[PDB]
Amino acid sequence: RIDSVSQLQNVAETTKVLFDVSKETVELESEAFELKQKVELAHEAKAVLDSW
Amino acid sequence: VSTLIPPKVVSSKNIGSAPNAKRIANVVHFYKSLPQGPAPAIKANTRLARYKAKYFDGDNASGKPLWHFALGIIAFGYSMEYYFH
């Protein structure tokens, strides 16, 4: 039981950083979503002007 | 879609698991036990406790008091022989 105690020693201190930095890396990419809008409109413009 | 959280749910976990019963059992088993044969009171005298200390502990444990008690009956009725026959 000492071993199963000692595995969880510094873990909460690390998962209060895991939590924050992981959810930041999740949710700082709707930036890239609104980048994708600017990408795909220019792609449509390039497609139709290639047709021209 | 979100952060799942089972790293820190040991709060209300540490009642339900099976060696928790053994842990809370032997933390109670270990506190009031005398350390090293202490408080032994290895000598006591009540005009016959020395007889038990010399004869009836775990160390000596030999059948000789039986022998003594055998001689006691040899001491008893033979005198009653001198009272009777």
**B11 shares contact with chain A (CB less than 8 Å):** no
In angstroms, this model's resolution equals 3.8
Q: What CA–CA distances, in Å, run from B57 to A39, A44, B46, B52? A: 96, 103, 16, 7
- Which ranges constitute the DSSP H helices of chain B? 19-29, 49-55, 64-84
- Under a CB-based contact definition with an 8 Å cutoff, are residues B10 and B20 in contact? no
Cβ distance of A11 and B5 shorter than 8 Å: no
Going from the C-alpha of B30 to that of each of A26, A28, B17, B25, B49, the distances in angstroms are 50, 54, 21, 9, 31
HEC per residue, B8-19: CCCCCCCCCCCH
Q: How was this structure determined?
A: cryo-EM
From A2, which residue of chain B is nearest by alpha-carbon distance?
Answer: B23
Q: What amino acid is encoded at B54 in this protein?
A: K
Q: How far, in Å, CA of A46 to CA of A35, rounded? A: 17
> Which residues lie below 8 Å from residue B3, measured CB to CB, with a gap of 6+?
A19, A22, A23
